[PDB]
Amino acid sequence: QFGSTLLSLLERKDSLSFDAYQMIQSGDLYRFSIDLQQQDIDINKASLE
Amino acid sequence: DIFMYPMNNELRGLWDRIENRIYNLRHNLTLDGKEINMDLYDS
């Protein structure tokens, strides 16, 4: 019973670690997103000119 | 006699015309006083 109990805990742990990693990983794309959005703003400024 | 003969306009016309050209020369402008530079834009 002890062994099985512990096992389940490790499964829990790795689940959380995966989700955490995934979230922080996904957080980086916003960098590029911001870059390109701002770039479009500047482009529109030039068009206005 | 409340009025006086004013300075006649053509004179100031001349003065101003030359002063305008002079100003353009002050700032390296066209005779039209337009910028001579291309005024490039970026960000």
Q: Which experimental approach was used here?
A: cryo-EM
**CA of B35, closest CA in chain A: separation in Å?**
16
> What Rg do the C-alpha atoms of chain A give, in angstroms?
22
Tokens of A1: 């019973």
State this model's resolution in angstroms: 4.6
Tokens of B10: 């053509």
Asked if B24 and B33 count as a contact pair (C-beta separation under 8 A), the reply is yes
> Which residue pairs from A37-41 have beta carbons closer than 8 angstroms and sit at least 24 positions apart in sequence?
none
The answer, for B43 touching chain A at a CB cutoff of 8 Å, is yes
Region at A37 (left for phi over 0; alpha for psi -120 to 50; beta for the rest) = alpha
Which residues of chain A does B43 touch, with a Cβ-Cβ cutoff of 8 Å?
42, 45-46
**Residue ranges of A 1-49 with Cβ closer than 8 A to chain B:** 42, 45-46, 49
Residues 6+ apart with CB under 8 A from A46: B41, B42, B43
Asked if B43 and A42 count as a contact pair (C-beta separation under 8 A), the reply is yes
At CA A18, angle to CA A16 and CA A21, rounded to 5?
Answer: 110
Q: Residue B43 and residue A46: Cα distance in Å, rounded? A: 9
